């Protein structure tokens, strides 16, 4: 599914993402935006290391979900990567919460640092009623 901006914001709010481990909703919105364009079906194969990024948050198969074909992976979230491609984002949100429980927090995604860190991200939630 391709989410509309405010529809996603409200969904994230309801799933408890606002302020999770100190990360505002706007930050999560910024992240989904640059990672997938708010698309749950997005997949990106990394030829470099043979891992794949899955779903709306582009979560990597070497550490957080199992896809079976990734060399030397772990499944920290203990989830099939297939779960990150559903229309329903409950699993993907549970997974993103696990990722940020590590010391790097949101810094885990380089896209976040490139496109969202030290920026005015209010834009992503303006007018959504969150």
Kindly report the CATH number assigned to the domain that includes residue 82: 1.10.530.10
Count of Cβ atoms closer than 10 Å to residue 9 Cβ: 25
CA distance 34 to 110: 10
Structure tokens at 28: 């999560």
- Residue 62 tokens read as 């070497």
Rounded-to-integer distance, Cα 113 and Cα 117, Å: 5
Q: Residue 101: give the domain boundaries.
A: 1-130
Among the listed residues 103, 65, 94, the one whose alpha carbon sits nearest the alpha carbon of residue 82: 65
Task: Give me the catalytic one of 7, 18, 49, 53.
Answer: 53
Q: Which of 35, 91, 102, 120 is catalytic?
A: 35
Resolution rounded to one decimal, in angstroms = 1.8
CB atoms within 10 A of CB 81: 26
Residue 26 is encoded by which pair of tokens?
């706007």
- Asked about 53 being catalytic, the answer comes back as yes
Give the C-alpha separation, 24 to 77, whole Å. Answer: 22
7 is catalytic: no
The residue among 102, 95, 6, 105 whose CA lies nearest residue 53 is 95
d(CA 56, CA 31): 9
Number of domains in the chain: 1
Query: Where do we find the tokens 């470099």?
Result: 48
Q: Return the number of other C-beta atoms located less than 10 Å from residue 45's C-beta.
A: 11
Experimental approach taken: X-ray
């Amino acid at each position: 599914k391709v989410f509309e901006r405010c529809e996603l914001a409200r969904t994230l709010k309801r799933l408890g993402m606002d302020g999770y481990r100190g990360i505002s909703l706007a930050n999560w919105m910024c992240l989904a935006k640059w990672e997938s364009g708010y698309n749950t079906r997005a997949t990106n194969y990394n030829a470099g290391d043979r891992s794949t990024d899955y779903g709306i948050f582009q979560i990597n198969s070497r550490y957080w979900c199992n896809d079976g074909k990734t060399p030397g992976a772990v499944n920290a979230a203990h989830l099939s990567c297939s779960a990150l491609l559903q229309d329903n984002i409950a699993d993907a949100v549970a997974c993103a919460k696990r990722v940020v429980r590590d010391p790097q927090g949101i810094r885990a995604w380089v896209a976040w640092r490139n496109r969202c860190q030290n920026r005015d991200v209010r834009q992503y939630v303006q007018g959504c009623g969150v």
